[PDB]
Amino acid sequence: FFRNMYDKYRDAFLSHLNEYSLEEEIKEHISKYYKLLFDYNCLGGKNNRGILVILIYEYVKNSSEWEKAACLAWCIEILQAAFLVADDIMDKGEMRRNKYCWYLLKDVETKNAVNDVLLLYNSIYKLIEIYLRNESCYVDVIATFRDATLKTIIGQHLDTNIFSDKYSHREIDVNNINVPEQPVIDINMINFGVYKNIVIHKTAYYSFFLPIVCGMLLAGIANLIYKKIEDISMLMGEYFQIHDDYLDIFGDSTKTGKVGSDIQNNKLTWPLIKTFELCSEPDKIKIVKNYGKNNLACVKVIDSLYEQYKIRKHYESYEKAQKAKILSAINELHHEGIEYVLKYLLEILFTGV
Amino acid sequence: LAFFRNMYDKYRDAFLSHLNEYSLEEEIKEHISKYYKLLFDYNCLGGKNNRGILVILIYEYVKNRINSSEWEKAACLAWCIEILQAAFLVADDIMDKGEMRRNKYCWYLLKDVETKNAVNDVLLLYNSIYKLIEIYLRNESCYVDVIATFRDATLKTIIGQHLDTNIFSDKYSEIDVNNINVPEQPVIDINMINFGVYKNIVIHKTAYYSFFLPIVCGMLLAGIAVDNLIYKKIEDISMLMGEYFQIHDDYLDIFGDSTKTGKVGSDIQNNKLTWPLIKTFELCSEPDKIKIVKNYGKNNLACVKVIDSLYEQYKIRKHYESYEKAQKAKILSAINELHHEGIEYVLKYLLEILFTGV
Ligand SMILES: O=P(O)(O)C(O)(Cn1ccnc1)P(=O)(O)O
Ligand SMILES: O=P(O)(O)C(O)(Cn1ccnc1)P(=O)(O)O
Ligand SMILES: C=C(C)CCOP(=O)(O)OP(=O)(O)O
């Protein structure tokens, strides 16, 4: 039903903008643009986050109560949209959900895309106000979105700068606008400790913690269960991001809906760390020389090393062991309702529905 | 006001401290602190601080004097509007291909930053506000009213920034979801060159976050009830002031000195619907309208020189001076209708320091 409800939350927000003191023709233009900004970026995904709000709420506890839950559910889908528009600018994305990235469109470009990230982000809080301002969890829901957003921003910053020169005794150069940085990996950062730090922040909080907490706050949970949920969410985000990093190398872009770019974008990935952990000293030198380069021969070397050190096999073994670790933590929850949803989510996570 | 200048470090370090509580390795926490301290210092400092100072003054002149704990909450809100200014200017300079901001290179231009960090940093600066309002005002009765004013002021600014950026775009003069290879050739839309459309843009991109938001912050914190009719009068004065302030800005883009303004002029080449463009279109001959269509929105010296020459020809400097004189009077007349001596002094004073600061 949540999928039918989409139009309702979008049109509620578009109606808010239509109340602005603008000339009728200008209101018509802004409606056309923003309807597309929402449809294009909120639709086409698995909707795992939104569906998770709906299920957690149902299994913790009418149409009026569903109107509030589906609002929160669509707000996380709007947050996903905001983060993916910004991520694709940052990661020089080509494709998103089998459509061109929003920032690439000649009618949009980076100039609109930056402004649109802020619009999508701010639409959430207007929608929570419209549907939940008189709820007791209202300020607690507002704070959950803000804290999970702040954590994602830090994660995105680490993902984007972990190998940067400013981090590899000297300070950021405020006088350099002409000498580009040559991306090189920092071997001191190639460890799972650093990787887990990035991954819990850029994915776990907004993808797992935020939807579960939304459903729980709305259903009325005040409680030490929230720390257990936080810990499961971290295990789940790590598991989900490792699979994503796997797909960037071994996935099919027609199936994933996006084009792989981590080797050329100098990302600290799970396949990188796993390879560094297993490979020979000359192969470490090969990685340093060829990683972080938007050049076919360079990415081919890295890709060949991922085949050589059987990264596909190590991932399969990781997934098996991490799913067990997640299930073991879920069993310690002592809440049958939440446990069913989380066990179910774990099964559909990579496929959706 | 002295409390404001000196308490910057306090709000900056309170937010930095919040991030230092994250589950991160000690060396990674040290790197995040170094980066974010600079993102705040570089983009929150160097301005007139008119918005922040306005919160401080409105609060002071609404109340009957104020303890340090009350000042801590006012200066928080004041610095939060300076952080909002920082977020909006960082994004604005990406959109407008800015070169200089407050006599320093724009943040997005730095090789250690770039657009990839700048976009993420706009979101950080924006979200830092709400964390700071929570830390210092969560137990206040105006708490929900303050965060709602920030988000509505921001939503209105985003719409104006969109109109400022797309008013002359082909999609407005259906959006093509299949075109990522055929660039749009920037052209002015003569049907949009009117003050009606101009006021719609400037009221949204400037008046709400620059005038309405800081006055309402000081008023909500001082305890004026959200149902009070004075808030609509303030909204109307803020619109008059926002329009007045933006027109002066457009004036400075052509006639200002970049060492004094701290920024390099670009509205002609960036194809903006400005006050000098509308005033010239209103006064000029049909062949001069053709000259504008042919030479505006072109990053080319000869093309910009034509537009500059037309602004000298139609005495835009003189028409601006006549506008400023008439708009200042209209603002003062609306201020006199407030029936609040405290707010009236602050707004009269603001109107004097608006272009200089202090
Ligand atoms: O690999 P990323 O972190 O950029 C990604 O997973 C998106 N993302 C953004 C934040 N967390 C995850 P995507 O591979 O979809 O481009
Ligand atoms: O001319 P803009 O509106 O882009 C500007 O005034 C910034 N701005 C952005 C919104 N309102 C004002 P700036 O000339 O400082 O680059
Ligand atoms: C956050 C990660 C790891 C990848 C993007 O999220 P999803 O894979 O949930 O994207 P959609 O289903 O929303 O397309």
Ligand SMILES: C=C(C)CCOP(=O)(O)OP(=O)(O)O
């Ligand atoms: C919003 C407009 C019109 C120009 C930028 O604002 P300011 O001129 O107040 O900028 P700073 O004082 O903050 O540099």
Ligand SMILES: [Mg+2]
């Ligand atoms: Mg990314």
Ligand SMILES: [Mg+2]
């Ligand atoms: Mg990406």
Ligand SMILES: [Mg+2]
């Ligand atoms: Mg990925």
Ligand SMILES: [Mg+2]
């Ligand atoms: Mg600008």
Ligand SMILES: [Mg+2]
């Ligand atoms: Mg601008």
Ligand SMILES: [Mg+2]
């Ligand atoms: Mg300007």
